[PDB]
Amino acid sequence: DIRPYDPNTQRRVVRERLQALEIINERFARQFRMGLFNLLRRSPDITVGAI
Amino acid sequence: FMEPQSAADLIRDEHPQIIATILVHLKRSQAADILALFDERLRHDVMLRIATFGGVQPAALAELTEVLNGLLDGQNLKRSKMGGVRTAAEIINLMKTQQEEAVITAVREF
């Protein structure tokens, strides 16, 4: 368990799931799909990547 | 009064019966152009549905018209006749003999 310290190292912070952020992202994806279809006159396909 | 591909993709995101009704209500040439751009399955389904079209209620027609009006975009001055191919040929004719040799080369290449 004992390790030497390096000032140029850092750790992670577990998991911070944000379901509300994902819902906002999906709603924004829908709105942006509509906007891009309106603008470019062609139907786009927007896929929300993993946060 | 719109481009075939744009209208095809627009009505492609609709129920096939609605697509068939719109195509029946559209111009024959425009509908034929739209149907040529559809996939085989959708095209066959539309052709089957058109062969068994029995009329639509006026309320449904009004709602469909309102939805189509809502789906409209900045279609004012849609498309524009500027040039292409012929203009490219004219430009090639104005470019040097060595340049037109390069032209034969690249055009054969594509």
Coordinates of C-alpha atoms in Angstrom, one line a residue:
Chain A
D1 CA 0.0 0.0 0.0
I2 CA 2.9 2.3 0.8
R3 CA 4.1 4.2 -2.3
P4 CA 6.5 7.1 -2.9
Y5 CA 5.0 10.5 -3.5
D6 CA 5.4 12.4 -6.8
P7 CA 4.2 16.0 -7.0
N8 CA 3.5 15.5 -10.7
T9 CA 0.9 12.8 -10.1
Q10 CA -2.9 13.0 -9.5
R11 CA -5.7 10.6 -8.8
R12 CA -9.4 10.3 -9.9
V13 CA -12.6 11.0 -8.1
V14 CA -15.0 8.0 -8.2
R15 CA -18.1 8.5 -10.4
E16 CA -20.3 11.6 -10.6
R17 CA -23.3 10.5 -12.6
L18 CA -25.5 13.4 -13.8
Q19 CA -28.8 12.0 -15.2
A20 CA -30.2 15.6 -15.5
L21 CA -27.2 16.6 -17.6
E22 CA -27.8 13.6 -19.9
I23 CA -31.5 14.6 -20.2
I24 CA -30.5 18.2 -21.0
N25 CA -28.0 16.8 -23.6
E26 CA -30.8 14.8 -25.3
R27 CA -33.1 17.7 -25.4
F28 CA -30.4 19.9 -26.9
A29 CA -29.7 17.1 -29.4
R30 CA -33.3 17.2 -30.5
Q31 CA -33.4 21.0 -30.8
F32 CA -30.1 21.0 -32.7
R33 CA -31.3 18.3 -35.0
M34 CA -34.3 20.4 -35.9
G35 CA -32.1 23.5 -36.3
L36 CA -29.6 21.7 -38.6
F37 CA -32.3 20.2 -40.7
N38 CA -33.8 23.7 -41.0
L39 CA -30.5 25.3 -41.9
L40 CA -28.7 22.8 -44.2
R41 CA -32.0 21.6 -45.9
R42 CA -31.0 18.0 -45.2
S43 CA -31.9 15.7 -42.3
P44 CA -29.0 15.2 -39.9
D45 CA -28.4 12.4 -37.4
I46 CA -27.1 13.5 -34.0
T47 CA -25.8 10.9 -31.5
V48 CA -25.1 11.9 -27.9
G49 CA -21.8 10.5 -26.8
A50 CA -21.1 9.2 -23.3
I51 CA -20.5 11.9 -20.8
Chain B
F1 CA -42.4 24.0 -56.0
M2 CA -39.4 22.3 -54.3
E3 CA -36.4 20.1 -55.1
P4 CA -37.1 16.4 -55.3
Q5 CA -34.5 15.2 -52.8
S6 CA -35.4 17.7 -50.1
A7 CA -39.1 16.9 -50.4
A8 CA -38.3 13.2 -50.4
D9 CA -36.3 13.4 -47.2
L10 CA -38.9 15.6 -45.7
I11 CA -41.8 13.2 -46.3
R12 CA -39.5 10.2 -45.6
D13 CA -39.8 11.0 -41.9
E14 CA -43.6 10.3 -42.0
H15 CA -46.1 7.4 -42.0
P16 CA -46.1 5.6 -45.4
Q17 CA -49.9 6.2 -45.8
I18 CA -49.3 9.9 -45.3
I19 CA -46.4 9.8 -47.8
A20 CA -48.7 8.1 -50.4
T21 CA -51.5 10.7 -49.7
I22 CA -49.0 13.6 -50.1
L23 CA -47.6 12.1 -53.3
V24 CA -51.1 11.7 -54.7
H25 CA -51.8 15.3 -53.9
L26 CA -48.4 16.3 -55.4
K27 CA -47.6 16.7 -59.1
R28 CA -47.1 13.5 -61.0
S29 CA -43.6 14.4 -62.2
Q30 CA -42.6 15.6 -58.8
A31 CA -44.0 12.5 -57.1
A32 CA -42.2 10.3 -59.6
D33 CA -38.9 12.1 -58.9
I34 CA -39.5 11.8 -55.2
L35 CA -40.3 8.1 -55.4
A36 CA -37.2 7.3 -57.5
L37 CA -35.1 8.6 -54.5
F38 CA -36.8 6.4 -51.9
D39 CA -35.6 3.0 -50.8
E40 CA -37.0 -0.2 -52.4
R41 CA -39.0 -1.2 -49.3
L42 CA -40.6 2.3 -48.8
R43 CA -41.1 2.6 -52.6
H44 CA -42.9 -0.7 -52.7
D45 CA -45.0 0.1 -49.7
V46 CA -46.0 3.5 -51.2
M47 CA -46.9 1.9 -54.5
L48 CA -49.1 -0.7 -52.7
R49 CA -50.8 2.0 -50.7
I50 CA -51.5 4.2 -53.7
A51 CA -53.1 1.3 -55.5
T52 CA -55.6 1.0 -52.6
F53 CA -56.2 4.7 -51.8
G54 CA -59.8 5.4 -50.7
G55 CA -59.9 9.1 -49.9
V56 CA -59.0 11.2 -46.9
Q57 CA -61.2 13.1 -44.4
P58 CA -61.3 16.9 -44.8
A59 CA -60.1 17.4 -41.2
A60 CA -57.2 15.0 -41.7
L61 CA -56.3 16.9 -45.0
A62 CA -56.4 20.2 -43.1
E63 CA -54.2 18.9 -40.3
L64 CA -51.7 17.4 -42.8
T65 CA -51.6 20.7 -44.7
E66 CA -51.0 22.6 -41.4
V67 CA -48.2 20.2 -40.4
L68 CA -46.6 20.5 -43.8
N69 CA -46.8 24.3 -43.5
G70 CA -45.2 24.1 -40.1
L71 CA -42.4 21.9 -41.4
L72 CA -41.5 24.4 -44.1
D73 CA -38.1 26.2 -44.0
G74 CA -36.6 29.2 -45.6
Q75 CA -37.5 27.9 -49.1
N76 CA -37.7 31.4 -50.6
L77 CA -35.6 31.6 -53.8
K78 CA -34.9 27.8 -53.6
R79 CA -32.0 26.7 -55.8
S80 CA -30.3 28.8 -58.4
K81 CA -29.2 28.4 -62.0
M82 CA -25.6 29.6 -62.1
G83 CA -23.4 27.1 -64.0
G84 CA -21.7 23.8 -63.9
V85 CA -20.2 21.3 -66.4
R86 CA -20.8 23.6 -69.3
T87 CA -19.1 26.5 -67.5
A88 CA -16.3 24.0 -66.6
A89 CA -16.0 23.2 -70.3
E90 CA -15.9 26.9 -71.2
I91 CA -13.1 27.4 -68.6
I92 CA -11.2 24.4 -69.9
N93 CA -11.4 25.8 -73.4
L94 CA -9.9 29.1 -72.1
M95 CA -7.0 27.3 -70.4
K96 CA -3.7 26.5 -72.2
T97 CA -2.9 23.5 -74.5
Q98 CA -0.7 22.1 -71.7
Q99 CA -3.4 22.9 -69.2
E100 CA -6.1 21.1 -71.3
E101 CA -3.7 18.1 -71.5
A102 CA -3.6 18.1 -67.7
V103 CA -7.5 18.4 -67.9
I104 CA -7.9 15.3 -70.2
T105 CA -5.6 13.5 -67.7
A106 CA -7.6 14.4 -64.5
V107 CA -11.1 14.0 -66.0
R108 CA -10.1 10.5 -67.3
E109 CA -8.7 9.8 -63.8
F110 CA -12.0 10.6 -62.0

